[PDB]
Every structure is written in structure tokens, then in C-alpha cells.
């Protein structure tokens, strides 16, 4: 980050990150270019999948992980996590409490 708390960005593509628990189920990562700086930053989406929701080529809101850097575990060196696509807050789309906009 540049010191602030968040950064809004654009999906370019969808990667592949797997897991060992419960078995080999895909945990994924996404590729987001920064709008304001142009640096290209990876991120992780903590849930059961939810790669299905977002899309290629849409507007996300990146957020910190809360460890002063310091990636969590066996996902390799990923430092940031995703909160809002299209302004409607993925967790609310996760339960069922919202339906996503057109784009």
C-alpha cells in the first residue's frame, strides 16, 4: 500500500491455488491491476471458492491482510484480500443477502 487502508482495482485474470484440506479443492487467486498506481498486485479470496461470483474484467476493492505484510501460510507470498466487487461487499453476496449488479 501507499500507507492508506484500501485500493480499488480491476481484475485481469484468474489464477489457480489449491489446498490439501478437506482434499484437493481449489482456493484460487486473482490478478488485479491498481487503478491509481498501475502496479500489479495479487490477492486471495477467503471463502469456499467464490471465484464464481466475481468475473474477468470487473471492479474490485482490495484490502490488507493485517499482519504488517507477512503472508498467512502455504499460499505463496500473497498479502492482500478482497472485500467489495461492484460496491456490494462479497460477504453479503456470500450468504445470500444481496444480488450482484450487472457489472
Amino acid at each position: 500500500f501507499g500507507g492508506s487502508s484500501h485500493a480499488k482495482g480491476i481484475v485481469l485474470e484468474k489464477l489457480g491455488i489449491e489446498s490439501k484440506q478437506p482434499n484437493s479443492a481449489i482456493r484460487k487467486c486473482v490478478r488485479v491491476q491498481l487503478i491509481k498506481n498501475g502496479k500489479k498486485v495479487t490477492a486471495f479470496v477467503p471463502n469456499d471458492g467464490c471465484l464464481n461470483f466475481v468475473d474477468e474484467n470487473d471492479e474490485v476493492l482490495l484490502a490488507g491482510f493485517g499482519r504488517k505484510g507477512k503472508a498467512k501460510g502455504d499460499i505463496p507470498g500473497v498479502r492482500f484480500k478482497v472485500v467489495k466487487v461492484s460496491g456490494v461487499s462479497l460477504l453479503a453476496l456470500w450468504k445470500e443477502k444481496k444480488e450482484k449488479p450487472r457489472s
Binding site: 484437493s24 481449489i26 464464481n52 468475473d55 474477468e56 460496491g87 445470500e96 444480488e99 450482484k100 449488479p101 450487472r102 457489472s103
Partner: protein, 534 residues
């Protein structure tokens, strides 16, 4: 960023602004339309000829549209082309499970600016408790569905309705706040019809019959990317079908001309303009004496180094003449290359919120793709290992499928809305929303696999010297699969040795352990069934 850029520049006062009034059939929508146009034209015009051209000055002319709440098609057709949603509500909606599902359609196909209008909350409410109920609606909608919209509250002053400052607030929000761009709408030419004339090439036995379609001249204004560029292009008529246009009319020494004049040979283009085939790639040159003697000196390249439309149709057939009516609004689309084709399409789905069912693969589903509404059988499949090894029987809350079906193909991966159809007297909405998703990719000639199961139940097993007690009855089957590899759901594979002339289930096979006594010993990979075409 450029898709919004192509839209705004030709748009000016004769291209109108799209406004729909959507709501329940019982409430006075028509009264709000009359009192709304009472502000625009001077003070007294309270007669509805909708849709009609509302000349609101030289700054911004508009056109207003209402549709009844029982029509299943045009409720969808109005949702994707709108620029302002004006919803009229009653004092009796909010957990009505069958009347307010169109909210999700406007949610998914593109939401413009929306409005809540409260009118019957005065004949029903009489006390201070209406203030908490209005704020309760503000907790529900529209402040929760979009942050940045205004919930309006108006008096119940039904016919006899006010001209005063409250529709100056309504015409304040209409007059000031403009539209946000819709992505896949502005990449298409699309036009609303305004006037509608029927030209029959006057009376003859080849003018009326069972099969006769006549020359329909239709009239309106343009929206989106420009449609008049060329005659004979394609078009879609909603509810009726896809057609081409016959003839479109529009009402808002030079080599570059001689090349397009095809009565002239190209040597006469070169001949007139001054003074043989692409199967030879290497271009033409002259002789080595001419290029050599001509290019002895190299000085010659020394600087070379450092609006309104009148649209003609030959359509539509005679049976739609008997479906003539007051103009319940009709919209024209425009189909693109790689979407006039047919093909099998692969699309990501999930289950829909405020929906109360499950979806088997055999019940057909009504799908809205862009401008086209089509009934198609939604066969589902899943992978479980980044490769497919099964399909499913109905899409659950548990998993969320990869749906595949056959119809028109749509390359640009559009969002994808799926309505379960009901009749005109089942719920209170003309459809009810089954599922929603997105076109993931286009893929013709794909083949689903469903792995069935030949069954053998174990009882007393060892590793090398392995029988199954109860699995078969034919010997030649095992004679054919003796060159194969068998299994068990536990995951320790086997390989059948020999049938041993016992077609009783008992025969010798192989396992790379001894399969346990609470297992199920089976065989895999069955017939890859076809796709239902419709």
C-alpha cells in the same frame, strides 16, 4: 470507457430519454402519468395516448412508457433498455412473495436510476405510525438496494391530482439527475418504435390471405451505436422473431470514387486516373537491366534515411395482424456476427434468492439472452477434479453447476438470466425467477459423461486371490473386459484376470491390496449421453 463515449455525442433533443412507470395493476399509475404530463404541457391535458412523443422543449424531450403488471414478456423487455426506473408502491407490499420479483430482473440486466413513489399510504394510514413505516421501507428499499436514490412520498389525491411543488421535486429529480452507462446495451444499435403504419400495396388477392405479409413502415428515434449505415441488415422483433430489413429510410479523376465503380476495369482506373492476382505474393518488378541501370544512382531516396427513422419491412405474417392492439411497447434490437449462428454454449449458474424450488434437467427453462427469449432444456454438469467425471440430476443449494445447452451462440460472454415460466394466473408476476448466471464460454460439439455402476458386493476377500460373490451373469462379458482395470469406491484398483467359465459373479481378478468387508466393488466410465436439442 469508449462504449459510454459513443452514446452521448449524437444524443440530443429529438432522441428522447427513456422513462418507465412500473408497478402493480391496481394502483393509479395512469393518474400519476396524467399529473406528470400536466406539468409539461400547460395545465390541463389528462388524456393518455401512450407511447407518445413528449416534446419537453429544445433542452430535453422525453418519452414515457407504462406496461401492465401481468405481461411476462414486456416486463423483461422494458428492463434492459431503460434509463430511469420509476416504481409506484402501495401500502401493502414488502413480503409479498409473488408480486415483486421483477426487482431482481432490473437488478441483473442493468440497473438504471430507480425511484420509490408512495401514494396509497394516506387512505390506509391515519396516524403517526406511518412515519416509522416509511422509514422501515427506507430500511428495505431503495436505500438498501442502492445507496444514492431517493424514496418519494406523495399525497393520495387521486384523480384531481396536484400540479404543485411535489412534482417540481419529481421533475427536479427527473430534470437534473441523468443516467449511468450500461455496458452491453451501448454496443448494439437499438430503437423504440413511435408510430406504426401498415402498407398493404392496395387491395388485391395477393394482399390478404392465410400467409400474406405486407410492407410495414415503422417510425422512431435512434439509441446506442448507429443503425443506419447500410441497407439489408438484420434486426429482432421482440415476441415475433428475427428478421432482416428490406429498405431503411433516414430522417434527421478521383480514384476513391472510381475504385468503387465496378463497371470500370482496374486498368481503366489506372488509365483514367493517370496517363495480377494475390496468388503471387512477391510483388511485380521490372527487368534487371531496367532496375539495375535505373538504380545505378541512389539519390532519389536520400531523404529516406537519417435521429428519426422511416423503416420499411416486408414482414410480419398475417397472424400478427389479428394480434393487433393498443401499443403495448415494442422494442427493436440488433444482432451481431457470431450471434446469428447457433451453437452449444457453456454457462456458469447458481440458485436464486427469494426462489423456492429445485431444477431437474428435463424441465425446460425460459432464458433471456440479450434481446432474445428462448425456451431451452438446461442440462447441468460438474467437474470434481478439474476434469468431468459426472453430471447431476438437480442443481442444489449444496453445489452450483456448470450448465450447458444448445441455442443461439453468444461469444462476448453476456450475463444470463433464467426465468421459470408460469401462466397469466399463477403468482402475480408473469414469470418467477429460477436462476441467474453468465455465459462462460462458447463450445460446439461437447459431450457430457455420466458414470454408471455395475455392482458387486464383497463378503470375504484377499488381495491376490480375489473373487466377487454377486456381480455378473455372463461369461463373455468378463472375457471382453479381461484386458481392463476395475475399482472399488475405497480407491484400491483391480484388474480382472480371467472369467474361469463361471458366469455366477465368482471369477478371478486382481487388487493391489485386499479390499475390505464394508466396501463396494464396482466398475466405471459409462456411456457419454447426447444433448437434447430444442
Amino acid at each position: 470507457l469508449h462504449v459510454p463515449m459513443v452514446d452521448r455525442t449524437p444524443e440530443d433533443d429529438p432522441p428522447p430519454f427513456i422513462v418507465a412507470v412500473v408497478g402493480p395493476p391496481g394502483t393509479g399509475k395512469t393518474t400519476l402519468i396524467r399529473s406528470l404530463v400536466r406539468r409539461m404541457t400547460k395545465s390541463t391535458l389528462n388524456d393518455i395516448q401512450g407511447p407518445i412523443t413528449v416534446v419537453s422543449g429544445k433542452h430535453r424531450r422525453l418519452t414515457f412508457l407504462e406496461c401492465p403488471a401481468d405481461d411476462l414478456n414486456a416486463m423483461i423487455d422494458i428492463a434492459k433498455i431503460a434509463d430511469l426506473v420509476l416504481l409506484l408502491i402501495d401500502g401493502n407490499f414488502g413480503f409479498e412473495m409473488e408480486t415483486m420479483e421483477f426487482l431482481n430482473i432490473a437488478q441483473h440486466h442493468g440497473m438504471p436510476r430507480v425511484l420509490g413513489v408512495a401514494t396509497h399510504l394516506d387512505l390506509f394510514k391515519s396516524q403517526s405510525t406511518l412515519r416509522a413505516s416509511k422509514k422501515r421501507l427506507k430500511h428495505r428499499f431503495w436505500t438498501e438496494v442502492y445507496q444514492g436514490a431517493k424514496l418519494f412520498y406523495l399525497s393520495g389525491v387521486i384523480n384531481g391530482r396536484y400540479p404543485d411543488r411535489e412534482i417540481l421535486n419529481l421533475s427536479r429529480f427527473i430534470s437534473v439527475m441523468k443516467f449511468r452507462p450500461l455496458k452491453w446495451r451501448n454496443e448494439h444499435p437499438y430503437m423504440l418504435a413511435d408510430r406504426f403504419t401498415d402498407l398493404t400495396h392496395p387491395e388485391l388477392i395477393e394482399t390478404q390471405g392465410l400467409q400474406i405479409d405486407r410492407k410495414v413502415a415503422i417510425y422512431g428515434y435512434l439509441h446506442g451505436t448507429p443503425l443506419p449505415s447500410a441497407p439489408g441488415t438484420r434486426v429482432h422483433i421482440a415476441g415475433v422473431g428475427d428478421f432482416s430489413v428490406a429498405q431503411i429510410e433516414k430522417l434527421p479523376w478521383n480514384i476513391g470514387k472510381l475504385i468503387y465503380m465496378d463497371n470500370i476495369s482496374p486498368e481503366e482506373c489506372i488509365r483514367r486516373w493517370r496517363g495480377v492476382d494475390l496468388e503471387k505474393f512477391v510483388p511485380y518488378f521490372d527487368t534487371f537491366e531496367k532496375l539495375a541501370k535505373k538504380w545505378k544512382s541512389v539519390d532519389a531516396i536520400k531523404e529516406r534515411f537519417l435521429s428519426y427513422v422511416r423503416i420499411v419491412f416486408e414482414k410480419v405474417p398475417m397472424e400478427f395482424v389479428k394480434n393487433f392492439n393498443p401499443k403495448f411497447p415494442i422494442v427493436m434490437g440488433g444482432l451481431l456476427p457470431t450471434e446469428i449462428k447457433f451453437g452449444i454454449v457453456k454457462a456458469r449458474l447458481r440458485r436464486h434468492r427469494w426462489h423456492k424450488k429445485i431444477l431437474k434437467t428435463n424441465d425446460p427453462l425460459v432464458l433471456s439472452l440479450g434481446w432474445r427469449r428462448f425456451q431451452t432444456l438446461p442440462i447441468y454438469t460438474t467437474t470434481d477434479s478439474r476434469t468431468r467425471t459426472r453430471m447431476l440430476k438437480y442443481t442444489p443449494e449444496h453445489t452450483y453447476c456448470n450448465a450447458a445447452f444448445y441455442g443461439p451462440l453468444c461469444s462476448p460472454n453476456t450475463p444470463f438470466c433464467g426465468v421459470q415460466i408460469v401462466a397469466n394466473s399463477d403468482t402475480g408476476n408473469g414469470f418467477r425467477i429460477a436462476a441467474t448466471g453468465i455465459v462462460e464460454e462458447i463450445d460446439v460439439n461437447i459431450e457430457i459423461v455420466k458414470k454408471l455402476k455395475l455392482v458387486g458386493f464383497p463378503y470375504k476377500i484377499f488381495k491376490n486371490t480375489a473373487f466377487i460373490k454377486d456381480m455378473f451373469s455372463s461369461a463373455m462379458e468378463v472375457a471382453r473386459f479381461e484386458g481392463a482395470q476395475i475399482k472399488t469406491v475405497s480407491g484400491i484398483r483391480g484388474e480382472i484376470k480371467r472369467a474361469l467359465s463361471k458366469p455366477e459373479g465368482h471369477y478371478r481378478a486382481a487388487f493391489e491390496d485386499k479390499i475390505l468387508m464394508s466396501d463396494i466393488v464396482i466398475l466405471r466410465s459409462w456411456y457419454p449421453v447426447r444433448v437434447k436439442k430444442f
